[PDB]
């Protein structure tokens, strides 16, 4: 989530008070990513595929 942080008055230097300008407001964001490339792995079978594993447990 975006974050916004603003300093308190106690943390503002004397020169900044004299110039009447506030510094050090900090923001933070994250960005999405459009998809460019994709790769696939096909597999073809000609004969009868063999029986699968029958270990019907809950995989640890």
């Amino acid at each position: 989530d975006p974050t916004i942080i603003i300093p308190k008055r106690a943390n503002i230097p004397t020169n900044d008070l004299a110039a009447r300008i506030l510094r050090d407001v900090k923001v933070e964001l994250v960005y999405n990513n459009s998809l460019h490339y994709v790769k696939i792995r096909a597999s073809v079978v000609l004969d009868r595929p063999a029986g699968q594993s029958t270990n019907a447990q809950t995989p640890m």
Binding site: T14, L17, A18, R20
Partner: protein, 59 residues
């Protein structure tokens, strides 16, 4: 003004060792108000001077 009165006591007082004299006594309380005059005055305020200091951060 008048305020109140006390008990009235009757008394007999011997005189010359022969006779008793009749008497009485009482206390009457009054209100009053007294006024007195001062012995001078202070000076007036003709001129007033005030100094002001405005603390600020710009200077």
């Amino acid at each position: 003004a008048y305020s109140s009165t006390s008990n009235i006591a009757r008394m007999r007082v011997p005189l010359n060792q022969q006779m008793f004299e009749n008497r009485a006594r009482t206390i009457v309380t009054f209100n009053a108000t007294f006024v007195e005059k001062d012995l001078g005055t202070f000076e007036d305020i003709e001129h007033i001077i005030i100094g002001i200091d405005v603390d600020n951060p710009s200077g």
